[PDB]
Structures are given as C-alpha cells and as structure tokens.
C-alpha cells in the first residue's frame, strides 16, 4: 500500500484509525499513529491487506505508537487533502496562534489554529498529559491522523477531543472545540525515528 498521512487502517480486523506520518528506523519502515489505536503486536491492515504490526506504544499517560511495516510498503512524504497532497517538509513545532490542518479517515482534511499547549485530557482509561489543542474539528476514526501546517511542518498525531452525539465536533463553533493532538517531536526521539520528507 502507499503510506500517506490521513488514510484509514484497521487494527486486528476491528478498530479503525488514521495514519499519521511515514517514518524510518534504520532500514525499517513504519508510520507513527496514536497509542490508543492498538497494543504491541496488533495487526494493521490497509485495504484488507496486512501491512505491519504495532511495534511500541504508550497510552494512557501519553498517546503515541509506531507500526513497523513490511518492506513491500511504499513510504511517502505526503498527507492526504482530498485528492491532493501536502508535502512533509520537517517537524518545526508551531506556536500558539499558528494555523494548522489535520487529516484523517472520518472528517477528511480540516484546518483551524492552535489554541493551547500542555493540555491534560481525562479519558476513561487515565489521563494523557502534554497534549496541544487546536480548534480544527475531527471525529471518531480520525485518531492517529496527521496535524501539519500547510508549509509542511508536521506537528503531531490526533489523540481525542470533545465529541458530540454525531461522532465529531464539526457542528459546534470553533470557539468551543477542543481537538487534542500528541506532539510529534517526543515520539521521534523516544523511538529513534526519522521522518520521511520531500
């Protein structure tokens, strides 16, 4: 499969999440995603084909994971935006007030701004600390997806937010949305990963 930020993948033929970013670990291919999407050694499938397994994750506390892929997978420096793509250029962290977009299989590509950093989400499983909050909307299924500036600087992976009964927070005004993402830089250093760029 071609590995692109924002596309769907299933975990153990049950849950769905979105790919965050193509990364390498030496000769090994992978993509980073959210920790709550799978446990270590769970099977990832894209289009009904096995592409790799969860290699490591931390959830709750943090919310991060990387999936190691078989070598038949094609890593690409891109994030889906409808039929078009945003090139991943690096991972400079943007400040509060910066505009940012995110990509996932449920709501597609949505943009907004970063409103706060170092937010704690108190999920049923336990707290996840150190999350950045943006007000781009998102929905169930978007977890693990890319947050990136249009200049191609990769920001993080979707963790969670304030869902309404329709399964997303797109029908409530931006001022009222809390869409939380896990910062990419600590995931890269923690697992020794390098971002694929173009």
């Amino acid at each position: 499969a071609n590995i692109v930020g924002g596309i769907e993948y299933s975990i153990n033929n049950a849950s769905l999440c979105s790919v965050g970013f193509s990364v390498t670990r030496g000769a090994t291919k992978g993509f980073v995603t959210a920790g709550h999407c799978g446990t270590v050694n769970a099977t990832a499938r894209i289009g009904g084909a096995v592409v790799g397994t969860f290699a490591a994750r931390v959830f709750p506390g943090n919310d991060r994971a990387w999936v190691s892929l078989t070598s038949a997978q094609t890593l690409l420096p891109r994030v889906a935006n409808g039929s078009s793509f945003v090139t991943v250029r690096g991972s400079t962290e943007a400040a509060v007030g910066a505009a940012v977009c995110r990509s996932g299989r449920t709501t597609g590509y949505q943009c907004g701004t970063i409103t706060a950093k170092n937010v704690t989400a108190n999920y049923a499983e336990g707290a996840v600390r150190g999350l950045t909050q943006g007000n781009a909307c998102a929905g169930r299924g978007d977890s693990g997806g890319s947050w990136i500036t249009s200049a191609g600087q990769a920001q993080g992976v979707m963790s969670g937010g304030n869902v309404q009964s329709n399964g997303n927070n797109c029908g409530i005004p931006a001022s009222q949305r809390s869409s939380l993402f896990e910062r990419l830089q600590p995931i890269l250093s923690q697992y020794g990963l390098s971002l694929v760029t173009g």
Partner: peptide, 4 residues
Amino acid sequence: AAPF
C-alpha cells in the same frame, strides 16, 4: 474528552 474521549479518544478518536
């Protein structure tokens, strides 16, 4: 908030 909930995960996603």
